[PDB]
Design a protein around this ligand. Structure first.
Ligand code: HEM
Ligand code: HEM
Ligand code: HEM
Ligand code: HEM
Lengths: 146, 284, 146
């Protein structure tokens, strides 16, 4: 994945401030609240009936941490997203049966959460760099589907 | 959305389909599974082999529901009520996939109806399948705007207040940088940061949303002149409204730390989707 | 663009039977009828008031010919679609201002036209191969946008 020197710098600088635990639970929780059909993959997580229930669900918080942790390691390998995520791509297709459109929804929510958390520091050019990155990761995760 | 001439065209084409509905339904599914493999993720419990009893049976259910829809074209939301419920509460199929099946159903009809599939009928059939898809996904997020959604939107927009214009221009700037293809609609603009053209346009967009919030229960009339303008003069591809909507959400998030809760996020997203739906309602 | 030996052959075999002028005029006319907002580029083409007027417009027909001729030559370079269409990509962005979503809509309408034209010979596997190709062409034409 090709980013300009300015884009890569903006991405890495912001991420150094991200607490992956906190942001990861927030991003997955909002996904389940804003786009409730995504709850179809998480029937064993318990109570997802209301926003307050989703956002305080410890299984949601845990999974969020796992998901953004893996996203985090991808940011260290921006020039080969496909190779970095190949195993997880196969896992999501063959074992979990996750429609890759969900990866794009999560990207949208993640950008909203970064904007919410960082306010004015999340400038239009920083967002633009993050949009390239979330699209690259979604494409990488979808690549081994068949 | 469906003119009476559209409805006549659909009745004629589907009447031609006749007893082959079931077979055509199964062909459309096979074409979708092959051309759009990600759709197979909704059927891991099926034998998806060619000619499988599961696929043929499902194809026949799909066609009968379309038959039912054709028979009740002027009351489709009521006719497909149980099916809307089922896809929204149980199957939970991402809405993007309805477009993929619709395309494969159109390809199937084209391949079997040489005489019937004229440009006008093609157009009517495409509009018809888009309407069906719209009805099948109409209950995915609680349906239209609930009073709790309306409350949430009015509270957040009231906080926006006099900054509505300013936030309109930021949303545009974010869209132009993040989604460079949208710039193709503004070749007459200076798009540089701080441009007065972009600020003036952002204020117009913001003012229109202000009007929409104030008429949240009467949005099509409030926005009728704008629906006209986008559909018949500007002719902006409908995909682009989702992109501005996202950038408006990001803008609100960055300026509303206390207000932008998960619930208010969900309500705002539903509201901008409704606005987007109104603005593209007269395109075809 | 990566297709299997069987897919490239299925694509090329059918295309050998196509009258490019005829199918070009048919595909561009149906584009303008089915998705009328795409008419925004063609106000200098005269009367587009009805479907019949569109389909029988000589300017529409000639454009359809120009466009599918370029498409046709692209089929000779399926392993280098990006390189083949690079200059045209820049042209469509910098000078023509064509939203690349238009290319995807044209791809959809072209597949329909091939199905109408060839009937049962346009089998699900041949369709699948053509879907990859029209997506590859759309992506290549959008590649130099900025
Ligand atoms: C940024 C995109 C994503 C990344 C990097 C990612 C990564 C991961 C990782 C690392 C695992 C753990 C596998 C294991 O420990 O066995 C996992 C599992 C899972 N993910 Fe993904 N994920 C992403 C997106 C999604 C989305 C959006 C959905 C669905 C809405 C989803 C649904 C699941 C499910 C259902 C599991 C298994 C949970 C369980 O074991 O009970 N993932 N993901
Ligand atoms: C024109 C659009 C569609 C129509 C008219 C339609 C209609 C139906 C009908 C009639 C049923 C069976 C209900 C019953 O008898 O209990 C069904 C089930 C189902 N649909 Fe939809 N459908 C559409 C699109 C889609 C799409 C796009 C997908 C996924 C790619 C999908 C996935 C499913 C699944 C997974 C089932 C359950 C099948 C089973 O397990 O028996 N549907 N659909
Ligand atoms: C929530 C969505 C939107 C709203 C509320 C909105 C509203 C408006 C308004 C109020 C005007 C000015 C009308 C007048 O001059 O009286 C306008 C113009 C325009 N809109 Fe939209 N718009 C939306 C989305 C979009 C999108 C997504 C695009 C394209 C990416 C777009 C492209 C344009 C263009 C090209 C103009 C004309 C500007 C000029 O030349 O002065 N709009 N819009
Ligand atoms: C497969 C997709 C397409 C291909 C291969 C293609 C190719 C071409 C070619 C070869 C030219 C001539 C450039 C020159 O004169 O140097 C052209 C021009 C043009 N194309 Fe595209 N095109 C495609 C799609 C589209 C679509 C979907 C639209 C708009 C809805 C469009 C709009 C135009 C316009 C407005 C011109 C200029 C006509 C003139 O000045 O006479 N193109 N295209």
């Amino acid at each position: 994945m090709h980013l300009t020197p300015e884009e890569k710098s903006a991405v890495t600088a912001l991420w150094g401030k991200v607490n992956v635990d906190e942001v990861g639970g927030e991003a997955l929780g909002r996904l389940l609240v804003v786009y409730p059909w995504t709850q179809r993959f998480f029937e064993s997580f318990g109570d997802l009936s209301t926003p307050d229930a989703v956002m305080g669900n410890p299984k949601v918080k845990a999974h969020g941490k796992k998901v953004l942790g893996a996203f985090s390691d991808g940011l260290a390998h921006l020039d080969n997203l496909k190779g970095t995520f190949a195993t997880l791509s196969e896992l999501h297709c063959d074992k979990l049966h996750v429609d890759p459109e969900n990866f794009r929804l999560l990207g949208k929510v993640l950008v909203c959460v970064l904007a919410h958390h960082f306010g004015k520091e999340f400038t239009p050019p920083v967002q633009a760099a993050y949009q390239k990155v979330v699209a690259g990761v979604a494409n990488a995760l979808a690549h081994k589907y068949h | 959305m469906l003119s009476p001439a559209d409805k006549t065209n659909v009745k004629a084409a589907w009447g031609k389909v006749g007893a082959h509905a079931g077979e055509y339904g199964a062909e459309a599914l096979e074409r979708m599974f092959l051309s759009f493999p990600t759709t197979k993720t909704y059927f891991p419990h099926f034998d998806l082999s060619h000619g499988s009893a599961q696929v043929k049976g499902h194809g026949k259910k799909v066609a009968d529901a379309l038959t039912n829809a054709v028979a009740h074209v002027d009351d489709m939301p009521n006719a497909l009520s149980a099916l809307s419920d089922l896809h929204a509460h149980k199957l939970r199929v991402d809405p993007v996939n309805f477009k993929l099946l619709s395309h494969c159903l159109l390809v199937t009809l084209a391949a079997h109806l040489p005489a019937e599939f004229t440009p006008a009928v093609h157009a009517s059939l495409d509009k018809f399948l888009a309407s069906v898809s719209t009805v099948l996904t109409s209950k995915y997020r609680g349906g239209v705007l609930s009073p709790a959604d309306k409350t949430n939107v009015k509270a957040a927009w009231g906080k926006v207040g006099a900054h509505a214009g300013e936030y309109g221009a930021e949303a545009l700037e974010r869209m132009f940088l993040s989604f460079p293809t949208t710039k193709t609609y503004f070749p007459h603009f200076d798009l540089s940061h701080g441009s007065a053209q972009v600020k003036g346009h952002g204020k117009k967009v913001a003012d229109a949303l202000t009007n929409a919030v104030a008429h949240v229960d009467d949005m099509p009339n409030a926005l009728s002149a704008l629906s006209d303008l986008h559909a018949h003069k500007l002719r902006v591809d409908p995909v682009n409204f989702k992109l501005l909507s996202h950038c408006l959400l990001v803008t609100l998030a960055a300026h509303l730390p206390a207000e932008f809760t998960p619930a208010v996020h969900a309500s705002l997203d539903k509201f901008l989707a409704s606005v987007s739906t109104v603005l593209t309602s007269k395109y075809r």
